From a paper:
The staphylococcal phage lysin LysGH15 demonstrates great potential against methicillin-resistant Staphylococcus aureus (MRSA). Lysin (also known as endolysin) is a cell wall hydrolase that is synthesized at the end of the phage lytic life cycle and is involved in cell lysis and the release of progeny particles from host cells. LysGH15 shares very high sequence identity with other lysins of class III staphylococcal phages, such as LysK, phi11, and MV-L. Moreover, these lysins possess a modular structure containing an N-terminal CHAP domain (cysteine, histidine-dependent amidohydrolases/peptidases), a central amidase-2 domain (N-acetylmuramoyl-L-alanine amidase), and a C-terminal SH3b domain (the SH3 bacterial binding domain, which typically contains 60–70 residues and is homologous to eukaryotic SH3 proteins). To elucidate the molecular mechanism, we determined the structures of three individual LysGH15 domains using X-ray crystallography or nuclear magnetic resonance (NMR).
Numbering used by the authors: 189 to 373
Write the structure that this text describes.
C-alpha cells in the first residue's frame, strides 16, 4: 500500500500549459527516504530549490509530491527551461536512498516509484514506452540513474563512463515493463 503525500514546496513553478509527455526516472544519488526529503524540503528556502527539485520523491511505501506535474514544471534534468527541455516536457521522479540503501531496499524503493508512475500515466493518458519513460542521461551527459543502471544492466556509469544506447535501452525496457505491469494490475 502506497502513501502519497501532497505537500507542495514553498515556491511556485511555472505552468506548462499541457500534461506531461512522460516521466524521467532519476536516482537521488543520496541518503534520504521520500519522507526525509519531504521533511527537509517541503517548507524550505529558495536556496535549496535553486539546486534542483523534482516533482516527486519515492521510496518504499511512500511518495512525496513536491510539485503537481499535471501543469507545472520542475528542475530535474538540468537542461534549462526551454520548451524542448526535459524540465518543461517531462515529469520527474527520484528513487530515493540510491547510495545509502542496500540492494534489496533500493529495489523496493524502485517498485514504489514504478507503481506511482503507473498511476500517473493512467491519469495523464500516457502509455509506457521508450518515448514516455526516460533517463536523466538522455538530456544531459550525467551518470544518472547510477544505481538503477548498475542493478539492471550490470554497467556502472559512475566508474565506466557514458553507456551505449543498448545499455540505456536495457534499463528503460526494464522500467517500462514494470510500469506496464502496475498499469495492468
Ligand atoms: Zn493536455
Ligand atoms: Zn537525475
Ligand atoms: Zn547514513
Ligand atoms: Zn548494505
Amino acid at each position: 500500500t502506497l502513501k502519497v503525500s501532497k505537500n507542495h514546496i514553498n515556491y511556485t513553478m511555472d505552468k506548462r500549459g499541457k500534461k506531461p509527455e512522460g516521466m524521467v526516472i532519476h536516482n537521488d544519488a543520496g541518503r534520504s527516504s521520500g519522507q526525509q526529503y519531504e521533511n527537509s524540503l517541503a517548507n524550505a528556502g529558495y536556496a535549496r530549490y535553486a539546486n534542483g527539485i523534482a516533482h516527486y520523491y519515492g521510496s518504499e511505501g511512500y511518495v512525496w509530491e513536491a510539485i503537481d506535474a499535471k501543469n507545472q514544471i520542475a528542475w530535474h534534468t538540468g537542461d534549462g527551461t526551454g520548451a524542448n527541455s526535459g524540465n518543461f516536457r517531462f515529469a520527474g521522479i527520484e528513487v530515493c536512498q540510491s547510495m545509502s540503501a542496500s540492494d534489496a531496499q533500493f529495489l523496493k524503493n524502485e517498485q514504489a516509484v514504478f507503481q506511482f508512475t503507473a498511476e500517473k500515466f493512467k491519469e495523464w493518458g500516457l502509455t509506457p514506452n521508450r518515448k514516455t519513460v526516460r533517463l536523466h542521461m538522455e538530456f544531459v551527459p550525467t551518470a544518472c540513474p547510477h544505481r538503477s543502471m548498475v542493478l539492471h544492466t550490470g554497467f556502472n556509469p559512475v566508474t565506466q563512463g557514458r553507456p551505449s544506447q543498448a545499455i540505456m535501452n536495457k534499463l528503460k525496457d526494464y522500467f517500462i515493463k514494470q510500469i506496464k505491469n502496475y498499469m495492468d494490475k
